[PDB]
Design a protein around this nucleic acid. Structure first.
Ligand SMILES: [Zn+2]
Ligand SMILES: [Zn+2]
Ligand SMILES: [Zn+2]
Lengths: 172, 59, 83, 284, 229, 230, 608, 47, 105, 201
RNA sequence: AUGCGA
């Protein structure tokens, strides 16, 4: 799952006596453990593991004389796929006030994930059954998915039965 | 000390107070002090005995 | 409002709702350090303790059954047939 | 034309026409004339009712307004007389701020022992260069005042007297009392006082102090203030510096040929070089 | 302004474009699935205002939709029946053509010019082209024109006759739709191919003419003297 | 607002009384299911005797006052077992004794069915270990007292959901529009107002068809063939 | 909530009643006068809508309470409405009462003794004496003043008798008499009363010809001319727009002259408050100012949205101040300016201004009473589809709640619910610490918030909260030996510490599905923490009661924080109490699908 | 029609007897139904 | 417990002599005075107070506007939902009021 | 009508008594006994000391403490009485009953008790043992309990300084031991109770 | 609101 972010430094763009925020540091007093995530340019190392709370970038506003950071606020960890520096359509903007950061969130099939045949017979995965506990055929295999038969008498998804017998024939 | 668990919600008299004599005051004091001695309230009790002494003549 | 004891006319049995509230309030009392009148017998859940107290009717609570007029009957636990 | 419009309406819809006509009915002649006379009488009643509130705006600007300022002398015939020192520094405190030792002291370090506050600012270095004569004692007193205000501004986050005292150099009690009383919202009380004097400076008071500071720079700079260098020096928002200077009523715009020449800035950057000035005819 | 309107979909103007609503005209391409992306461009809406309706006759799938709207591509919920979907073989006219030459051929076929006809009624077939009333004939001539027209349509010798013309024949019917031969070539016609058997070649049919057309669903069910496609 | 008073009368939270008993019996639906399955309860007599053991409770109330009412009224009621010529001298026992206090205060419909069961099961009473209609009837009455609706039960709401929820599964208006036509609007204009008419046993089918034609409205239009205006 | 902080001043009833401008001025924390809202593009205007007397703001203390934005409850200011207007809420009423008067006598055009008749009925219905209310009609006899006074005597005697009886019999009380039927008999009576009130198309008591009253709808009333037959009849008895002020001056006097009856007309129950019935009740001479605390802008993530009240109120201040300035301009003309018809236009400004202010205040009440999609007024704020009551009172968001897609689990009890350890570590119970739970809570503390049977927080008995969110095993270790500390303040000696323990296998939880179609669809299940889960685990036997299916259905999990609610969720809402539906009493809870085929197969005589 | 009931209530000078379960919710009061149909008191030793 | 105790449950000030929850205020403290609950209806203007026909000692309380009052010290705190307070916002504008009953009055 | 409201100010703000000097030689009888009704909470933990529970809870912190309603410093309590929640016990029963909150285990009760109150008023002539002597006041201590001070401004100029030095009385001899004074005011806005004496009346 | 899970 990809989530794309726009990191803007022109929230208030503001009159225009300043526009100085610059990604980076100045006071040194920031926690140097931020380098574990943000490069000396204030942007995270593309590829970085990011967790809720981690700084996604660091910048400096002269008004505060402080190195500030945009914190990541999410329920899950991600990985940085791309960091894109945007100077485009701008008149000058060389100070690089817009950066777009792409997060890569891996999504493992999990209990509660919805699944469907091409027949609208949708179901959540109730459990990830141990392979030993699955039923094994005399061919020596254990199925990928088990769907309860009791769904069919109301749904009459008999096209799905034919797809089962056709996919088995067609694989053989 | 700000709520019910320490302070009553409401207090009202039902008749006009009664002007306890020095002797009634002293008898109350002696009974009250003796019953209390029998807790930072002790320090106020320490003042009450001085009041008692002052209600006896001299601290 | 005081329904005379000679005049109490309501169900001798504890309602499910009465029993429920009793168990909650008494449990809550013990959980706020009310003195337990029964053997703790190992228990740590105040609610199950209050259930033990109900089993022995040691509970010291009284039910005020209201009548929609507003008259009420004060009933001890120790008399209303619990169940 | 509206009437003609009505005709068009008449053709289009009976019902809608009816509605518009109803509107006309509602209007009627509107002001009746005999009715108008009666109404005039009513107006008299209104006079009694009327919320005889005041001038509305003149009073507000004169009095507490968007940000408080030192007392301007509207009848000043010279900009320097608009905000006299006693308006900048209260008479009671001004009479106690004696800087003779500061003027007489040549050693910067000893002068520092004479200052009421010491910090990381370059201001004292800037104004000190220009203060060599005893006639500038008053001017030096104003320098004292900025130092004092700077101490207040940087420690406006301090919420108790003792911690504030930790930043100053044994300033006269009168100065602290005046600043806290009129430029801060004190949390008053003997209960707090038995522990310490606790207080806080709210944003409007902060705005007030900043206006007083700009007033100081404006006076020492003869009402000609470089906007850009000052903003950079004080670590303030450009919009905040502009707004605060406008509250004082200075004119801020690109530098004139004379101003660019005097300040040594490229004429091409003059229009971008903002200057605050004050004139004779006081601001409205 | 067109970025704004196109960014909100609140098209508003002093004529109202003769449209019942001022929102909902714009949709996010929502590429969450390629299936969804292609599904977006064959989705068509009955409009928000009929979504507001309480009834369901608008939602009822009508048999007229055969070949034009999908009988199974319909969302479930409020939009059900409102968010129809085009058939995978459906096309939309985006131009109009050679309408100018059609009067000439009709005149050749026996249509009396309306200045000369001097007649009007359900008792006579009215030949119209794009809402330009050109003439009147007998209802029998209605049928002769419709069929001979289809022959000249499938033929290639009459360039004033574009393949995609829809031949609306309306026979006389007791309390039926008001008779006439309404041809259409203009824009926005929905058009779908069927195989014309007498010339064994593809022919484009629209939903209007379809109503009165016998289209066998497969070759073995072609009923004698009935299915023309 | 509609709930059970402690006296078993249905009062609103306002205090306005709506019904003097729930369905007129104060019986809980969550109990009734077996309250009328007597033979089964009997095959599990000893178990139910273990549930509702009376010796714990037989000491706190009276099992006769209502039974006495049962004797005088059961006699006169069996004497009056025509409807408007009712045993107006005897209200039902539920009016005369708190059903929570004198075991036997039961709807006369239930009392009658129970006795008739006890008589119709004399052959089951020729299959018991020794159980008698006074010991079994006593047990079933105790089931009745212990099946009563509790004081304070939210029976108004219970009713309301019991009408809504099953109405989701859903010549004259039927179903939801009909329920709406009644419950929701109390409309004085039914869409299909009908009046059912019982016809005497003597009324022939042909007489009935004559009356059906004879009562129906007849407009002049209904006989008109053609109108020509010249 | 804390059980450790009781209150004993519960509300027992609610009286409704109209405010009064003098009351507001006495209570008002300030008059807001300045149509400015913010100044210099960024500052709180002195004595304006954002004056600190209206509450705290921006680290500025409430100028009425000196309290922070997180502390000052806020205080209500007020606006002195120039001229008096019409209250929209009662505008239909005041119109009605306007139609009922006499214009030369200023009484109701209904027979005075008949009026008195009404007053009698309404007094008896304050006590709800219905039978007597019907019994009054029997008092019966050109009609002499001695006779009309005789009717007044018999009627007053009838009042005294019905009262003396009912008070003697205790069939009512000093507090009046209130029931649904009494309310209905009132609505019927007040209606017939209004119909008789409307019948008089000229005065009877005074014989005067009242003008026909017309209205615009919500901002103007007009006074119609009469016919020369009625005009010359008026001689023997010897359409124009009018301001609200004249309406007030007439209706005040009319309302006082008929105060004796209207006193019982305007109360359904005894007027214990001896309230004068004032015409100023329908008019607003002043406008309040709600707390700014309740007028703060909607900033959602970044966007700061202006308050709609600020906008309508600024519109009121602008219009009103303009009208005050026009009043200054006439106060200028008004030296004398004998023939300057120049004002013949500012006077159009006065009329237009006056309708304008009335309509715009209306707009402040109800957008649908003003003159495309304007900012909502209080009427729109209160109703639409929720009515502040429905959207934040009859239903609210709640704490201690989770929502998740449910997954089956047949091995747990049929009365339990499988809680995933995320929810098992993020849900707490406020445990008062005792000698009997000291061991368990001491261990839970040892685990800390980030472990099993752990705890996120510790609330001291002093009332203060200490979060364990970031405390080290060392710090929690130190507190574990401090969970049982002695008293410190006699103010607090009665309490014991609290531990916000995680939800555990001994807690009950209230599960609720989607369509809350019936009470049986929202039951309490006993919590079972399941390892390595992330989804709510539910037994199949319950799904036909929720009408739930693992297709993707999501459920709300509520964790009650209280022994009263615990006991209910373990004994009443519990699954066992729900074996039968109240609809029919057929069991709604049984095994399903596969379990059915399993019973059919297992129980076959073929099964060995 | 919340506002309509507001008008008729105020004009009546009505007093809420706080009986409606909903109304009581509005005032944040123990609901009068069921477990709130009654009050519970405590027996306490006097000696 | 759900719709109140766990949502917006607030112990809020109400005036035992006025029966309103929106006139309530914290009185400002003094060099000798702590914060005291005051009801705005229940106080007298220090400019009047019969001063011409007329003190307890402890009935004067001061506003952040430096206003002295006589009385207002008879209000208490009661448990309600905060939305209840939200109602005076609309309702008090609506020209109505709560007579919030209590014990004796 | 405007005299109902003035009856409200005078009759509500009226003062009951003006405790006189005993024999006009003692002190004002500012000590009075008043029967009241209070409303207190009871924790469960006092179920074995309920009358003392109320004492320890509310009455014990009230002694030596100012009450605005009674107008003074509580000198002591007499006769606690729990109002039974259920009638008939010629007030007497081996057990009482109390209402429990509908939310918590806490109880609320009516109580009847006699109070011993120190109710001084302005103008009372009192005698005190000199606590302190500073050039602006004279400290005294009433009954060894109430601190009293007479500030310089309320003292007659006829008083005489001897140097924080020492005061010499109006007669021409320095003050010592006990002082007789009139009560000008009693202050109570802080930490502990308070007062104010005068030497000019 | 557009769309959507149930
Ligand atoms: Zn405030
Ligand atoms: Zn009249
Ligand atoms: Zn009040």
């Amino acid at each position: 799952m990809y989530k794309t972010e726009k990191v803007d430094l022109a929230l208030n763009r503001n009159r225009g006596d300043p526009i100085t925020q610059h990604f980076g540091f100045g006071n040194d007093e920031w926690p140097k453990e931020w380098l574990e995530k943000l490069d000396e340019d204030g942007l995270p190392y593309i590829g970085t593991y990011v967790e809720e709370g981690d700084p996604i970038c660091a910048y400096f506003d002269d008004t505060l004389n402080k190195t500030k950071i945009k914190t990541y606020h999410s329920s899950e960890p991600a990985y940085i796929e791309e960091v894109n520096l945007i100077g485009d359509e701008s008149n000058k903007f060389q100070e690089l006030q817009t950066v777009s950061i792409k997060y890569r969130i891996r999504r493992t099939p999990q209990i509660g994930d919805k699944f469907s045949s091409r027949h609208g017979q949708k179901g959540v995965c109730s459990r990830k059954w141990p392979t030993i506990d699955m039923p094994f055929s005399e061919t020596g295999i254990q199925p990928d998915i088990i769907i309860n038969p009791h769904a069919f008498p109301s749904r009459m998804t008999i096209g799905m039965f034919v797809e089962s017998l056709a996919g088995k024939a067609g694989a053989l | 000390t700000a709520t019910t668990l320490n302070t009553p919600v409401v207090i009202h008299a039902t008749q006009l107070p009664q002007h306890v004599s020095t002797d009634e005051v002293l008898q109350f004091l002696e009974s009250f002090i003796d019953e209390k001695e029998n807790t930072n309230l002790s320090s106020s009790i320490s003042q009450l005995k001085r009041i008692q002494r002052d209600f006896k003549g001299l601290p | 409002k005081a329904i005379p004891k000679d005049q109490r006319a309501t169900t001798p049995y504890m309602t499910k709702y009465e029993r429920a509230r009793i168990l909650g309030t008494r449990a809550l009392q013990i959980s706020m350090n009310a003195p337990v009148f029964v053997d703790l017998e190992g228990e740590t859940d105040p609610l199950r303790i209050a259930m033990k107290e109900l089993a022995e009717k040691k509970i010291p609570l009284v039910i005020r059954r209201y009548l929609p007029d507003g008259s009420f009957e004060d009933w001890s636990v120790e008399e209303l047939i619990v169940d | 034309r509206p009437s003609a419009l009505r005709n068009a309406l008449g053709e289009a819809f009976g019902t809608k026409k009816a509605k518009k006509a109803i509107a006309d009915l509602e209007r009627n002649r509107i002001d009746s004339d005999k009715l108008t006379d009666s109404a005039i009488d009513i107006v008299d009643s209104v006079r009694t009712a009327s919320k005889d509130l005041p001038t509305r705006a003149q009073l507000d600007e004169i009095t507490s307004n968007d940000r408080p300022t030192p007392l301007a002398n509207i009848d000043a015939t010279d900009v320097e007389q608009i905000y006299p020192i006693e308006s900048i520094i209260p008479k009671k405190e001004l009479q106690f701020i004696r800087v003779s030792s500061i003027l007489k002291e040549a050693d910067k370090e000893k002068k520092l022992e004479l200052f009421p506050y010491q910090n990381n600012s370059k201001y004292v270095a800037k104004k000190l260069d220009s203060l060599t004569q005893p006639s500038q004692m008053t001017k030096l007193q104003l320098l004292y005042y900025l130092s004092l205000l700077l101490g207040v501004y940087e420690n406006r986050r301090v919420n108790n007297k003792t911690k504030l005292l930790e930043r100053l150099n044994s300033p006269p009690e009168i100065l602290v009392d005046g600043i806290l009383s009129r430029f801060t919202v004190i949390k008053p009380g003997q209960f707090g006082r038995s522990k310490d004097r606790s207080y806080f400076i709210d944003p409007q008071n902060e705005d007030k102090i900043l206006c007083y500071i700009l007033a100081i720079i404006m006076h020492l700079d003869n009402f000609i203030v470089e906007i850009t260098p000052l903003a950079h020096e004080l670590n303030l928002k450009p919009s905040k510096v502009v707004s605060l200077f406008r509250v004082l009523g200075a004119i801020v715009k690109g530098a004139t040929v004379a101003q660019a020449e005097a300040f040594g800035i490229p004429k091409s950057t003059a229009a971008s070089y903002k200057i605050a000035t004050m004139k004779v005819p006081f601001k409205l | 302004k067109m970025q704004y309107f196109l960014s909100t979909g609140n098209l508003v103007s002093q004529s109202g474009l003769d449209l019942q609503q001022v929102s909902g005209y714009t949709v996010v391409a929502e590429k969450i699935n390629f299936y969804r992306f292609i599904s977006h461009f064959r989705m068509v809406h009955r409009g928000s205002f009929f979504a507001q309706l309480k009834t369901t006759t608008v939602r009822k799938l009508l048999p007229e939709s055969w070949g034009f709207l999908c009988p199974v591509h319909t969302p479930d919920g409020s939009p059900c029946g409102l968010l129809n979907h085009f058939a995978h073989k459906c096309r939309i006219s985006t131009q109009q053509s050679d309408v100018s030459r059609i009067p000439s051929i009709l005149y050749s076929l026996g249509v009396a010019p309306a200045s000369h006809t001097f007649a009007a009624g359900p008792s006579l077939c009215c030949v119209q082209i794009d809402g330009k009333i050109i003439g009147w004939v007998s209802h029998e001539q209605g049928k002769i024109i419709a069929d001979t027209l289809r022959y000249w349509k499938v033929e290639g010798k009459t360039p004033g006759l574009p393949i995609d013309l829809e031949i609306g024949y309306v026979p006389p019917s007791t309390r039926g739709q008001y008779p006439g031969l309404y041809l259409f070539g203009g824009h926005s016609r929905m058009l779908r191919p069927v195989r014309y058997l007498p010339l064994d070649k593809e022919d484009i049919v629209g939903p209007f003419e379809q109503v009165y057309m016998n289209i066998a669903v497969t070759p073995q069910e072609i009923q004698n003297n009935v299915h023309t496609h | 607002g509609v709930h059970v008073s402690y006296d078993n009368s249905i009062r609103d939270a306002d205090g306005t009384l709506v019904q003097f008993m729930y369905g007129g019996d104060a019986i809980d639906i969550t109990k009734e299911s077996h309250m009328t399955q007597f033979e089964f309860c009997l095959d599990n007599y000893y178990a139910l005797l273990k549930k509702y053991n009376p010796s714990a409770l037989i000491e706190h109330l009276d099992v006769e006052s209502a039974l006495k009412y049962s004797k005088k009224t059961l006699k006169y009621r069996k004497k009056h077992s025509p409807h408007y010529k009712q045993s107006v001298k005897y209200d039902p026992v539920l009016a005369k004794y708190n059903p929570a206090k004198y075991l036997g205060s039961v709807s006369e419909n239930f009392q009658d069915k129970l006795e008739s069961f006890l008589d119709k099961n004399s052959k089951l009473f020729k299959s018991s270990d020794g159980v008698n209609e006074k010991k079994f009837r006593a047990l079933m009455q105790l089931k009745y007292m212990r099946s009563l609706i509790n004081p304070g039960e939210a029976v108004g709401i219970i009713a309301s959901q019991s009408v809504g929820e099953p109405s989701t599964q859903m010549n004259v208006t039927l179903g939801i529009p009909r329920l709406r036509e009644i419950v929701m609007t109390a409309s004085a204009a039914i869409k299909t107002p009908q009046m059912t008419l019982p016809i005497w046993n003597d009324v022939s089918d042909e007489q009935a068809d004559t009356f059906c034609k004879s009562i129906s409205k007849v407009l002049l239009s209904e006989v008109i063939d053609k109108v020509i205006v010249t | 909530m804390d059980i450790s902080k009781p209150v004993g001043s519960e509300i027992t009833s609610v009286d409704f009643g109209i405010l009064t401008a003098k009351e507001i001025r006495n209570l008002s924390a300030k008059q807001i006068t300045n149509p400015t809202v913010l100044d210099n593009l960024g500052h709180p205007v002195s004595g304006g809508l954002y004056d600190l007397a209206l509450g705290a703001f921006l680290r500025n203390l409430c100028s009425t309470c000196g309290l922070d934005e997180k502390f000052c409850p806020g205080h209500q200011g007020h606006i002195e409405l120039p001229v008096p207007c019409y209250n929209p809420l009662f505008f239909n009423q005041l119109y009605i009462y306007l139609r009922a008067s006499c214009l030369f006598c200023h009484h109701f055009r209904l027979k005075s003794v008949e009026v008195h008749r009404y007053a009698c009925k309404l007094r008896l219905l304050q006590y709800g004496l219905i039978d007597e209310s019907y019994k009054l009609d029997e008092i019966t006899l050109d009609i002499s003043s001695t006779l009309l006074n005789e009717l007044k005597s018999k009627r007053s005697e009838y009042v005294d008798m019905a009262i003396a009886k009912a008070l003697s019999d205790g069939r009512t009380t000093e507090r009046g008499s209130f029931t649904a039927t009494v309310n209905d008999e009132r609505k019927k009576l007040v209606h017939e009363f209004h119909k008789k009130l409307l019948s008089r198309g000229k005065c009877d008591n005074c014989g005067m010809f009242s003008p026909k009253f017309r209205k615009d709808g919500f901002t103007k009333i007009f006074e119609t001319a009469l016919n020369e037959k009625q005009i010359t009849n008026n001689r023997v008895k010897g359409s124009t727009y009018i301001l609200s002020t004249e309406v007030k001056n007439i209706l005040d006097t009319v309302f006082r002259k008929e105060q004796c009856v209207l006193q019982y007309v305007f109360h359904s129950r005894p007027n214990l408050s001896r309230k004068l019935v004032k015409a100023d009740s329908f008019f607003m001479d002043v406008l309040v100012v709600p707390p700014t605390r309740f007028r703060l802008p909607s900033k959602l993530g970044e966007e700061v949205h202006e308050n709609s009240q600020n906008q309508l109120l600024s519109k009121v201040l602008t219009t009103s101040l303009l009208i005050r300035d026009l009043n200054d301009d006439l106060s200028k003309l008004q030296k004398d300016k004998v023939s300057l018809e120049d004002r013949r236009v500012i006077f159009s400004r006065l009329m237009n201004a006056f309708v304008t202010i009335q309509n715009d205040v209306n707009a402040f009440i109800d957008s649908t009473k003003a003159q495309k999609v304007p900012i909502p007024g209080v009427k729109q704020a209160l109703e639409k589809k929720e009515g502040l009551f429905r959207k934040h009172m009859m239903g609210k968001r709640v704490n201690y709640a989770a929502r998740s897609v449910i997954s089956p689990d047949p091995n747990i009890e049929t009365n339990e619910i499988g809680v995933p350890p995320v929810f098992a570590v993020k849900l707490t119970y406020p445990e008062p610490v005792t000698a009997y739970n000291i061991a368990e809570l001491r261990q839970a503390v040892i685990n800390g918030p980030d472990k099993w049977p752990g705890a996120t927080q510790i609330q001291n008995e002093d009332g203060s909260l200490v979060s364990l969110i970031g405390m080290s095993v060392e710090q929690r270790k130190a507190l574990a030996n401090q969970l049982l500390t002695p008293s410190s303040n006699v103010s607090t000696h009665t309490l014991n510490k609290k531990v916000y323990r995680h939800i555990k296998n001994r807690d009950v939880v209230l599960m609720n599905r989607q369509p809350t179609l019936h009470k049986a669809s929202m039951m309490g299940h006993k919590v079972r923490v399941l390892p390595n889960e992330k989804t709510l685990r539910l037994h199949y036997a319950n799904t036909g009661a929720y009408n739930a299916d693992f297709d993707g259905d999501e459920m709300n999990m509520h964790f009650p924080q209280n022994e009263n609610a615990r006991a209910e969720a373990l004994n009443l809402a519990n699954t066992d109490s729900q074996y039968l539906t109240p609809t029919s009493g057929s069991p709604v809870r049984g095994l399903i699908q596969d379990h059915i085929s399993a019973g059919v197969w297992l129980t076959s005589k073929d099964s060995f | 029609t919340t506002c309509q009931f507001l008008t008729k209530a105020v004009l009546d000078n009505e007093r809420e007897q706080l009986d409606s379960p909903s109304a009581r919710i509005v005032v944040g009061k123990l609901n009068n139904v069921g477990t709130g149909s009654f009050d519970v008191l405590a027996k306490v030793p006097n000696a | 417990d759900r719709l109140l105790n766990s949502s917006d449950y607030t112990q809020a000030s109400v005036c035992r002599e006025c029966g309103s929850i929106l006139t309530t205020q914290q009185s400002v403290p003094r060099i000798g005075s702590i914060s005291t609950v005051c009801c705005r209806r229940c106080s007298m203007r220090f400019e009047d107070a019969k001063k011409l026909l007329t003190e307890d000692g402890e009935k004067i309380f001061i506003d952040d506007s430096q206003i002295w009052e006589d009385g207002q010290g008879n209000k208490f705190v009661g448990g309600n939902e905060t939305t209840t307070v939200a109602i005076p916002f609309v309702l008090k504008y609506l020209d109505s009021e709560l007579s919030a009953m209590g014990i004796r009055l | 009508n405007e005299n109902r409201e003035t009856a409200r100010f005078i009759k509500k703000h009226k003062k009951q008594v003006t405790n006189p000097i005993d024999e006009k030689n003692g002190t004002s009888n500012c000590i009075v006994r008043v029967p009241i009704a209070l409303y207190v909470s009871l924790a469960p933990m006092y179920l074995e000391n309920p009358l003392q529970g109320v004492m320890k809870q509310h009455l014990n912190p009230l002694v030596m403490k100012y009450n605005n309603k009674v107008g003074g410093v509580v000198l002591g309590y007499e006769g606690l009485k729990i109002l039974d929640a259920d009638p008939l016990s010629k007030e007497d029963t081996s057990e009482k009953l109390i209402k429990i909150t509908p939310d918590t285990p806490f109880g609320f009760t009516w109580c009847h008790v006699n109070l011993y109150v120190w109710q001084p008023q302005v103008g009372d002539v009192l005698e005190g043992y000199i606590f302190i002597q500073s050039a602006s006041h004279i400290g005294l201590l009433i009954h060894d309990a109430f601190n009293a001070s007479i500030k310089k401004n309320n003292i007659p100029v006829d008083w005489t300084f001897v140097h924080l030095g020492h005061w010499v009385d109006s007669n021409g001899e320095p003050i010592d031991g006990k002082l007789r004074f009139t009560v000008r005011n009693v202050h109570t806005t802080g930490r502990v109770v308070s007062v104010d004496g005068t030497l000019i009346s």
